Design a protein around this ligand. Structure first.
Ligand SMILES: *[C@@H]1O[C@H](CO)[C@@H](O[C@@H]2O[C@H](CO)[C@@H](O[C@@H]3O[C@H](CO[C@H]4O[C@H](CO[C@H]5O[C@H](CO)[C@@H](O)[C@H](O)[C@@H]5O)[C@@H](O)[C@H](O[C@H]5O[C@H](CO)[C@@H](O)[C@H](O)[C@@H]5O)[C@@H]4O)[C@@H](O)[C@H](O[C@H]4O[C@H](CO)[C@@H](O)[C@H](O)[C@@H]4O[C@H]4O[C@H](CO)[C@@H](O)[C@H](O)[C@@H]4O)[C@@H]3O)[C@H](O)[C@H]2NC(C)=O)[C@H](O)[C@H]1NC(C)=O
Ligand SMILES: *[C@@H]1O[C@H](CO)[C@@H](O[C@@H]2O[C@H](CO)[C@@H](O[C@@H]3O[C@H](CO[C@H]4O[C@H](CO)[C@@H](O)[C@H](O[C@H]5O[C@H](CO)[C@@H](O)[C@H](O)[C@@H]5O)[C@@H]4O)[C@@H](O)[C@H](O[C@H]4O[C@H](CO)[C@@H](O)[C@H](O)[C@@H]4O)[C@@H]3O)[C@H](O)[C@H]2NC(C)=O)[C@H](O)[C@H]1NC(C)=O
Ligand SMILES: *[C@@H]1O[C@H](CO[C@@H]2O[C@@H](C)[C@@H](O)[C@@H](O)[C@@H]2O)[C@@H](O[C@@H]2O[C@H](CO)[C@@H](O[C@@H]3O[C@H](CO)[C@@H](O)[C@H](O)[C@@H]3O)[C@H](O)[C@H]2NC(C)=O)[C@H](O)[C@H]1NC(C)=O
Ligand SMILES: *[C@@H]1O[C@H](CO)[C@@H](O[C@@H]2O[C@H](CO)[C@@H](O[C@@H]3O[C@H](CO)[C@@H](O)[C@H](O)[C@@H]3O)[C@H](O)[C@H]2NC(C)=O)[C@H](O)[C@H]1NC(C)=O
Ligand SMILES: *[C@@H]1O[C@H](CO)[C@@H](O)[C@H](O)[C@H]1NC(C)=O
Ligand SMILES: *[C@@H]1O[C@H](CO)[C@@H](O)[C@H](O)[C@H]1NC(C)=O
Ligand SMILES: *[C@@H]1O[C@H](CO)[C@@H](O)[C@H](O)[C@H]1NC(C)=O
Ligand SMILES: *[C@@H]1O[C@H](CO)[C@@H](O)[C@H](O)[C@H]1NC(C)=O
Lengths: 130, 120, 110, 117, 126
């Protein structure tokens, strides 16, 4: 199970940015995709998750007005393996949005903690400058 | 859901549907073979349940301890992260061993119950 | 960051190390579960504990967690140099997102 | 006594002989003979499958949680058990038999859900 | 450590009771040729079900060992339990009571039917 993210990008204030998250080695529809942000002045913060199966989303109020999540239709490899990708777009970037962005695979089906991240991508940097 | 409708669901989720799935000249010759075949498979499974003492129940607990070599997974890893199809592959080389252990435990249980009754 | 943790916890190698996590009683820990992560700087994190009681798959037996109404904590048995990293607690429920605390650093004496 | 010797007896009296009829349900031309042998087996198993579905397997007499609907019959127990044969009884409820069977199956399904807890 | 199928046949009846599951399992598992195979498959089913038909009637179904309420008749055998359980094979025992096998079976069936009749009445009184 592996996740791969779009590389670092420099943006002007007010610009939107889209970050891809390609996945492989596990069934894409079986687990939630969690977007997590880290900023030096805030520490790690949850940005919300999207189910690849239903398209259902759960975002923090902090990001509900700025962040849009979508996923690709999965393409099967084996009966228990598939590939696909998640995307997130952040609208109206602020300097406070600078930091490291991570894509992570959900832990399990039908548990009490289904959406919690288990496998993480390396993460990539977002920078904002005049 | 329906017959095998739970197959893609987790093992724990599937447990609610067991009740549903518990159910179920040339051409005439093939139908005869089809009828015999259907009977053999029904009885094959019932034969094992009757020996195990599990007959009449969809879910039957036994006294055989789980061996970690059959699987080292925790219950949450098994019941909530797997389908029954995936699980069947993991224990495919141990399934017959487990069946024999269930049978041995049943015979010892009944022998002990007989002895308890003899003392009363 | 309503949850708070000690800025750091120190101990010698082979020593038990305990990290507290607390917050408002509406947040921790009644009707809530706590997860615990390693989060080295510049790197993706590793998850150690789920439901404040169980080790995640692939996690060594030396790690364990404990829960109470007022607070929760992570204990590291047999401290090793590999464990000298930043840790975070997180509050969660099945119907809500992750809330990360202030975090703490584990320091090896010697 | 004997096979079906109780058929003309009262339903209550007949119940003493249930084992008499429960036994002997089992036991080119080679095909014809096999079809009959398979048929005897299928009918035996058909009834046994229903008992397994109803939770009544292994019992000659099995109580259920399904209430009697007075529209099926308004006759008293004394009238039914002591003044009727089973042959007559089946005729009176011949049009409700499939309904009753479905209700028993539904009741078992609810019981299984409770036993799981 | 199993003796294998019928490996207990030469053992005493008490020892043989350890291996009942070995025998119970494989009762179902163990063109000119095509018809003979079909006949073999049907026959094995009839054989298996014949014994199960009796057990279901006796209330013994689902059990390897089933105690009943029918008293032993000394005319069937005058042997003590040690003379039977520790000194005989099941093969020898079946011959000793071969003329009474059907008699015993009918008595078990009668006792089961009366038992269930009584169990119903006990519930009706509650
Ligand atoms: C195919 O495979 C996929 C693989 O994921 C299967 O999906 C998985 O299905 C399970 C359920 O079987 C999900 O777990 C449960 O998730 C809820 C939270 O759900 C979030 O999404 C909801 C919408 O999505 C679900 O429903 C749609 C249909 O409507 C499905 O298509 C989806 O697949 C999902 O199943 C959404 O409604 C939830 O809303 C809540 O949160 C929002 C946040 O913004 C609020 O607004 C809402 O008001 C609301 O609060 C939510 O966003 C968890 O709540 C479940 O936890 C309960 O159940 C656990 C298991 O028993 C238990 O351990 C927990 O403690 C908890 O228990 C409580 O609820 C039980 C159920 O009612 C009670 O019985 C219990 O007593 C207690 O009250 C649970 O974790 C997986 O998340 C989902 N996975 C993914 C990736 O989506 C899919 O089902 C498979 N398909 C088939 C046909 O098999
Ligand atoms: C085929 O047919 C044969 C013959 O009938 C069957 O053999 C019989 O098997 C039963 C199985 O239980 C035997 O019963 C037991 O008998 C022993 C008798 O002791 C002798 O045998 C021992 C065998 O290991 C041997 O060790 C003994 O001798 C040594 O040790 C003593 C003591 O230190 C020493 O003094 C000697 O010098 C030797 O060094 C001795 O020769 C008895 O000990 C057993 O007791 C236990 O089990 C019973 C039953 O559960 C229990 O009640 C006791 O409390 C105790 O736990 C047991 O009674 C029987 O003796 C065998 N008969 C013969 C003639 O050998 C064989 O099993 C059949 N095969 C099949 C496949 O059915
Ligand atoms: C839910 O299940 C997945 C997948 O597990 C796989 O499928 C299951 C149905 C079972 O058959 C498993 O036996 C089978 O592996 C779990 O994810 C898997 O975790 C393992 C590690 O425990 C991953 O392998 C590792 O990958 C890392 C990558 O850096 C290596 O360093 C390790 O050496 C090791 O190879 C594995 O890739 C991953 N999934 C798959 C498809 O491989 C998942 O953890 C589980 N969830 C829970 C809560 O148990
Ligand atoms: C064939 O039909 C006749 C007529 O219905 C049956 O006769 C009835 O048989 C029962 C016994 O099986 C008799 O019951 C007894 O009645 C006396 C009083 O007479 C009572 O004291 C006893 O406690 C018991 O109830 C019944 O009287 C009798 N009816 C008549 C009109 O004589 C007969 O039994 C049927 N045979 C079979 C095998 O069912
Ligand atoms: C598990 O199986 C192995 C097989 O060699 C056996 O040695 C071991 O004792 C078993 N464990 C338990 C607890 O039975
Ligand atoms: C079972 O045996 C097969 C080979 O027959 C092997 O491919 C498979 O991995 C084995 N399963 C386990 C769990 O070891
Ligand atoms: C014992 O058998 C005799 C016949 O040999 C029979 O007359 C007698 O009633 C039997 N006893 C019991 C209790 O069945
Ligand atoms: C069974 O009955 C026959 C006579 O019909 C007799 O020869 C034989 O010895 C009897 N068997 C036993 C075990 O008593």
């Amino acid at each position: 199970g592996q996740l791969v993210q779009s590389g670092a990008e420099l943006k002007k204030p007010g610009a939107s940015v889209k970050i891809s998250c390609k996945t492989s080695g596990y069934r894409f529809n079986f687990y939630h995709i969690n977007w997590i942000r880290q900023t030096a002045g805030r520490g790690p913060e949850w940005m919300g998750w999207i189910s690849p199966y239903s398209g259902d989303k759960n975002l923090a109020p902090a990001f509900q007005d700025r962040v849009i999540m979508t996923t690709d239709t999965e393409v099967p490899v084996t009966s228990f393996t598939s590939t696909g990708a998640a995307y997130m777009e952040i609208r109206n970037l602020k300097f406070d949005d600078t930091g490291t962005y991570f894509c992570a695979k959900g832990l399990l089906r039908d548990g009490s903690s289904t959406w919690l991240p288990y496998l993480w991508g390396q993460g990539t940097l977002l920078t904002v400058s005049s | 859901l329906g017959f095998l409708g739970a197959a893609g669901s987790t093992m724990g989720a599937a447990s609610i549907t067991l009740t549903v799935q518990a159910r179920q000249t040339h051409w005439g010759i093939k139908q005869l073979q089809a009828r015999v075949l259907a009977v053999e498979h029904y009885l094959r499974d019932q034969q094992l349940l009757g020996i195990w003492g599990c007959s009449g129940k969809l879910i039957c607990c036994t006294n055989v301890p789980w061996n970690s070599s059959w699987s080292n997974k925790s219950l949450d890893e098994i019941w909530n992260n797997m389908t029954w199809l995936q699980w069947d592959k993991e224990i495919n080389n141990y399934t017959q061993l487990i069946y024999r252990l269930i049978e041995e435990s049943q015979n010892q249980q009944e022998k002990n119950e007989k002895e308890l009754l003899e003392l009363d | 960051s309503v949850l708070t943790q000690s800025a750091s916890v120190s101990g010698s190698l082979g020593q038990s190390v305990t990290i507290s996590c607390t917050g408002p009683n509406s947040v921790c820990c009644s009707h809530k579960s706590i997860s615990w992560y390693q989060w080295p700087p510049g790197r993706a994190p590793t998850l150690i504990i789920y439901e404040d009681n169980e080790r995640a798959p692939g996690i060594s037996p030396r790690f364990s967690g404990y829960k109470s109404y007022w607070s929760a904590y992570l204990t590291i048995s047999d401290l090793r140099p590999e464990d000298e990293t930043t840790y975070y607690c997180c509050s969660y429920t099945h119907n809500s997102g992750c809330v990360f605390g202030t975090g703490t650093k584990v320091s090896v004496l010697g």
